[PDB]
Write a structure and sequence with these properties.
Four copies of one chain form a homotetramer. With about 500 residues, the first copy, chain A, is an alpha/beta fold. The first copy, chain A, has helices spanning about 45-65, 70-85, 85-100, 100-125, 160-170, 185-200, 210-220, 235-245, 270-275, 300-310, 330-350, 385-390, 405-410, 425-435, 475, and strands at about 10-15, 15-20, 25-30, 40-45, 130, 140-145, 150, 175-180, 205, 225-230, 250-255, 260, 290-295, 350-355, 375-380, 395-400, 420-425, 440-445, 475-485. In chain A, the strands form five sheets. Chain A has a seven-stranded mixed β-sheet, with helices on both faces. In chain A, strand 1 and strand 2 form a beta hairpin. The N and C termini of chain A lie far apart (about 80 Å). The structure holds nicotinamide-adenine-dinucleotide. Chain A: Keywords: Acetylation, Cytoplasm, NAD, Oxidoreductase.
Chain lengths: ~500, ~500, ~500, ~500
């Protein structure tokens, strides 16, 4: 089914229906990265269209916020059921536009409906407090929604980010206007269609397409109560600056340069597999990837030789093939960026052990796709450009270390702080290393296995706020303190 | 109460009072009751701010190693010392701020109670543990942020320092606190009390200064979080500066809170509530109910009662036991408030009492910044005194007819800090409260915010909270730790 | 009229018509006189835009090698061919645009006169030579820019194509022109005439499309300069896109031009001038004097004389010799103009004539987009129809007393394209013009902008010029060449 | 040197130095020769921008009422005061910028010569008058724009302030100038001199700040024009903000200019020329020829002579008469430049001399930002140091064979500011220059841009000009005035 699809319907979603935008802020083209074709050339939403989206979602927020948590729970569970029933239709579209393998996309759709189910349950038990106060009086808190929340999505995990941002928002009683990445506009509309079929009020989850301008219109609309952003550090900085004009709360996911520390007492088989899962999923375009692979000197050769052997066995090809594990990168400009990082690595003294070059698949229909082979680098130094900056491609930087105290200083020597990983069997070293890692999510003896039940978010310049877990409720709801006087007012005058 | 000047330096680093290393300005602190200066002091420059920030993460690495119970014990010692120094702190608070000794003691009590509440919260501070599929599991570590910055306001100086420092230190953080340049004195007493309690040197540092000093604090790369209390334009700047460092922010931005008086209310309590909603601390309160909506059927009787009690408010020396309204914070702010009254009367509002300069009988107070509490009637929603926060003793009384009408007008603000309802019908009370877009809602009282519950803004009054349990989430962060109990299932 | 359809491709490159290589969607062109669809065509995509730009870049490499006189020779041939095919072009202009053949002939005249004017300017185009100290000297080469982009509008299609192409080609440039999707037809006739005149194939290419095609043109890395004619919101978009490539921009964004009639004027000329300032090309003229300020002493006689003449304007088939107002461009724009009239009547304006749909006698014109020209009185500066450009035949008459009053109101606009004053006092005439913040000012006439002088915007009406000599500076650039006649005096 | 410290406020409004009203942060300017801070100043907030822009508007209405000769007289006085304070200004320029006193004297000379040149241009500033058909005629008024914004750079602070202010004020405009935060001091001296010369207070205002302050200036609704000098990314950002207000912009964005040395050149002149093209102002120059192409037959002899002379460049105290290279502007820029050398050595280039930190003999200079001038050989067109502007003393020497090859390689850049050719063949000199896509081309010298000719960018080096006559077209605009000498001929 690759090289076969092109968008038929309009790409914005309002009033529980698909719509072309009212006014424009540009025209982008979305590609099929496996082939290079243009699946879509569409219009970026202008100010009047963005205003329609927020306003139409504000009317839906009025309806949605009146239901109890259990009542909202019922509807989000139905949306989760429709996602399970349309998983293969959703996943296939996600692959066509994003480029990741069908194998991973099915797992992405799994994490998407599990997020909806998890937050549906959380909605049913959402609560404030009740506190006995002196003199018979008491106080209580109403956990209330915020209003119209804005979600600005990213292209690497398009449908999952739409599900990870909308699920806690709508479960807390909010509506959402979601702006997908211009690279991946298609899949978010399927989630918007699924929410309406599940029975949400029309407008509760609206989709506006666009780029930087559209997102700026969304972050500055006076009726947007909260902004959830996933993207780069420079852009996240801009998102917070725009929200300052309206006193809007912000949560952020800004990528990372997460460390993966492999000690010599580790299970080698798990450490090799873990390093691959920490670097080459979704073409290496994963924010929380363990891209600084620290290997203790005693196991560097055995680890490196095994990692290179398994990396070279990654099947590259048609994303819709069952055995494919790496498809094309998102688009050519990002492929050249990743290839540029590799060229500088060789100039700075790093040794390319495999991959890092253009890949031409056997299938002629994939000739113009944006393919490259996964790359493993060794002889890396903390001062290398490929070691400091997020590459967002399949580029594993292997660095040697000697002592635990040394590697912790190097692991924390970053402005990033999204994720981290340690491979070791010593119980005390495992819990100690993780406690010192300045990162939001830390993996012991695995990687990229973030569950839906626990918070995911950044430390330092990787952002603040969380997705998944219970604490995300605090970012999509707010507590109103209500004091109930049970006696008379004792005046001071 | 007309005799004090500071004799010691006004910055606090390394567990001792010290003078700033460099300068960003030079400001004068006043005793408002007399108008005489109590201090001309140096505003902390960039290098002094750097000295206070790095000295604070020297103490943050020592403090975060302690468990919650270990921090609880020490914060409990600080709370006890505050109780023992109640009259020394309160008297010092009065001299510099101007509020009555009656109120200052209540502020100092609410301050040490805040420390006790967060010391106790530290003792039970916890993450989660969750069983995951296949026998594996995950857990969350509730970790501190690092060096937190507290930017204080002048209305409740010692209490704001305690409301910001208590959850920070209870979560394992250090704090560098920048008091308002108007009120620099009391914050040092809290720093001395923290030191006597046994905190690591540097855990609570104080740097005095204004916008320049505050800008240096918000932009330092080692500042992990900013808590701000002040105006909307300045809070706006605080958020814009914090974007440069990806620093999380909590904000308390004042308000224009509505107070709705229904005809079924207890008149005596509703009248007292309106006074308590407007004239504490010279009307200089974050969350005052300054738009007092009174139902038409009871408007006249309510108005006549509120004015009768307002005229009986004792104005004078804050250190006198019977004083209930002292001077305003400083002369420029008194003229700002007096201007609001003059513009209100230009727009058609009827001044029923006060709003004018007061000259007290005691000759030592002749140059103090005094005025009589003001009651306005015949007010309209489009008036400046009805739209803008005055931060003075100016109650605007507006009439309303139906419940549906007053709900739309009460919410007709960019603010959303507090709100108040007086009524005896249980259904209307909780219904009005549920619709009021405000952070704290008082039913049949006002300004009775407990430490056990969150205080914070809706809409342009800010976001985040102080007091209560949810405040933990803004002074700590959760680290997810996944623990693999089996083998890694690779996709390749 | 009522017979024509496009039967050939609507894009032009390589000296020949061609259909686009890729699509941006499809639009339908109309015969506004009948509502007939005369063309359904494809909007050009990125690959078609790239073909036109590179094909223009190759033609630019040839064209720029010729001297000014050599370029003059070819544009003079193009000017002659336009004169010989004038009525064929005009007839084509009417069918697609709707303006009368009377006006269409005048537009085609200014088109070939523009080519002749710029052909002559090319022959003398020059830089400088300046003697510098020490016997050395410097000189400037006035060089072309490269591939320039012209974004056309629908009101004056062929004239806008000629006003953009003439200075571009005279300065040594090539041009890729994107006509308005409403009026794609007439620009191709100019492309055929350029080819017959002897330009290298590709020197003037035409790509059809809407916003997407225009976006591709402004962002192509080989586009050296963009000239835009249209609305203020779109002009902003043109500038935002051109910043990405550091491409020069000149803009004409319409206006809300004031026409000031003083009581000492010639009444007969002032009345006729007001009509020429409002009802040419169905009022779809950017520089129209649509705010007609009339001094109070002559308001009634001017208004009644203006209304009498407006009601005598013959509306009908534009290709008839007696027609002076045709249909508006398309149904959505006719309804937009009618909306301005309906809202004007709601805001308190008095419709004296017109503003309604017109049904012509000819049954073949039944579905054309016709309306009667409208004259409004009792207008106020704060009305929507007084501030915003209507782009239809809607004259707003406003009274004024003094010169100081009318100058403040005339300039109380963000626009600044044109202006007009009628008065016989010599000092007042030149004085009013000097105070008018407008690009072109007419004294005792209107809409008589010559090709020998610049036409362009002030304020949010745009910047840059068309016509006149200064336009050379926007389609050419100066290279400074220093020629050392001695030795280098080193500083080291 | 080492002595100076800024005493007075650094913003300039209403004729005097003034502290900004609100703040947008704090920045420190240093004495680069020593590293001692010379000024820690406030960055102008939004309210401060609104003040300076408004104060300049009132001076513009006064200053534009004078004729050109009247403006000429006043600008001539400003040029004279610069000559009388030349030694004071240059010394101040060195202390903050770091350039040698030798070069600073040349900068102040080029600055007052610019004012004299534009004073004279004001004296002859004119529009046109053209006889039109039928006895009627038209004329153009060359009118100012209003308040122009000048955003300066740190390499030539006083000259960039003078190159931007002179043509603006000569055309009748006012200017608010935002210096680069690195070098704020010298611009205040130019503001003091303009006031002493007799300009109306507010005509030339100075606001200090960085990106935020510049953003407020470029987006203010009363700013009529923006002149920018800086980097490609920031200038791009400057254009995007000006799109919101339809503001005209001229830009100078630096370059990567080629210097072509043919084998028939005078070796002695080409060697000196290569040094002048690379090591003036510590190599921090807009239009430096940092891609030095040397023909294969003369590569070896030219290289060793370039290296012999480069090693003889005296590095030391900028205020010393014999110094020819001072420190770089600041530590981040020195480390950035040193990085370019580190990347060059990684890409395979051979460092022939310099490129390393320099520690001067004078003990007061230990913490200055000094480095040795660097010469690279074995360079390739695809190297990072060959493509990217280094803005430091780094000459990249590349070998070439034929003229056709070097022309393609010289133009193989997105930049287009300057270019250079050394040859004695008359045809090759003028032929090479005509093909080089660069704004200024030097024949047998380099960096000798005269004030009588335009200097500006091609391609991504920007658009618009400074110096010369055409710069008037960017600081003035033409109003066309049609003068009807007969009656209006109505079409209806
Ligand atoms: N100043 C003039 O001479 C003039 C002429 C005609 C119309 N107008 C004004 O323009 C108003 C709007 O009518 P419009 O809808 O024709 O104006 P518009 O400016 O949208 O269309 C102008 C041209 O720009 C193109 N365009 C549209 N979006 C673009 C984009 N994003 N990037 C690049 N090119 C783009 C259009 O295809 C058209 O050719 C009219 O109502 C009238 O006021 C002014």
């Amino acid at each position: 089914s690759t090289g076969t699809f092109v968008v038929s319907q309009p790409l914005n979603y309002r009033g529980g229906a698909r719509v072309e935008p009212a006014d424009a802020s540009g025209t982008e083209k979305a590609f099929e990265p496996a082939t290079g074709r243009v699946i879509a050339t569409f219009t970026c939403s202008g100010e009047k269209e963005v205003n329609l989206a927020v306003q139409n979602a504000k009317a839906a927020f009025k309806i949605w916020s009146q239901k109890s948590g259990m009542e909202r729970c019922r509807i989000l569970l139905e949306a989760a059921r429709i996602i399970r029933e349309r998983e293969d239709e959703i996943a296939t579209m996600e692959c066509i536009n994003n480029g990741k393998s069908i194998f991973e996309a099915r797992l992405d759709i799994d994490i998407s409906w599990q997020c909806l189910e998890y937050y549906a349950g959380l909605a049913a038990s959402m609560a404030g407090e009740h506190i006995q106060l002196p003199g018979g009086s008491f106080g209580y808190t109403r956990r209330e929604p915020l209003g119209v929340c804005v979600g600005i999505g990213a292209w690497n995990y398009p449908f999952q980010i739409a599900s990870w941002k909308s699920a806690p928002a709508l479960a807390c009683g909010n509506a959402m206007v979601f702006k997908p990445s211009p690279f991946t506009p298609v899949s978010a509309l399927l989630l918007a269609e699924i929410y309406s079929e599940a029975g949400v009020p029309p407008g509760l989850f609206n989709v506006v397409q666009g780029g930087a301008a559209t997102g700026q219109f969304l972050c500055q609309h006076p009726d947007v109560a909260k902004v959830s952003f996933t993207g780069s550090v420079p852009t996240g900085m801009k998102i917070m600056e725009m929200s300052a004009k309206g006193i809007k709360p912000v949560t952020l996911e800004l990528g990372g340069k997460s460390p993966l520390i492999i000690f010599s007492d580790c299970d080698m088989n798990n450490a090799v597999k873990g390093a691959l899962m920490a670097n080459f999923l979704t073409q290496g375009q994963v924010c929380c990837n363990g891209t600084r692979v620290f290997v203790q000197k005693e196991i560097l050769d055995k680890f490196t030789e095994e990692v290179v052997k398994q990396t070279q066995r990654i099947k590259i090809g048609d994303p819709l093939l069952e055995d494919t594990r790496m498809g094309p990168l998102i688009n050519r400009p990002h492929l050249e960026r990743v290839l540029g990082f590799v060229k500088v690595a060789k100039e700075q003294g790093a040794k390319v052990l495999c991959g890092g070059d253009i890949y031409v698949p056997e299938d002629p229909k994939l000739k113009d796709g944006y393919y490259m082979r996964p790359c493993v680098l060794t002889n890396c130094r903390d001062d290398m450009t490929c070691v400091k900056e997020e590459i967002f491609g399949p580029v594993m930087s292997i660095l040697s270390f000697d002592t635990e105290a040394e590697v912790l200083e190097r692991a924390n020597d970053t402005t990033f702080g999204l994720a981290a990983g340690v491979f070791t069997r010593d119980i005390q070293r495992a819990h100690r290393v993780v406690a010192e890692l300045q990162a939001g999510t830390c993996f012991i003896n695995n990687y990229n296995v973030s569950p839906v039940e626990l918070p995911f978010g950044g430390y330092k310049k990787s952002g603040f706020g969380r997705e998944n877990g219970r604490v995300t409720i605090e970012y999509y709801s707010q507590l109103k303190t209500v004091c109930v006087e049970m006696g008379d007012v004792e005046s001071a005058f």
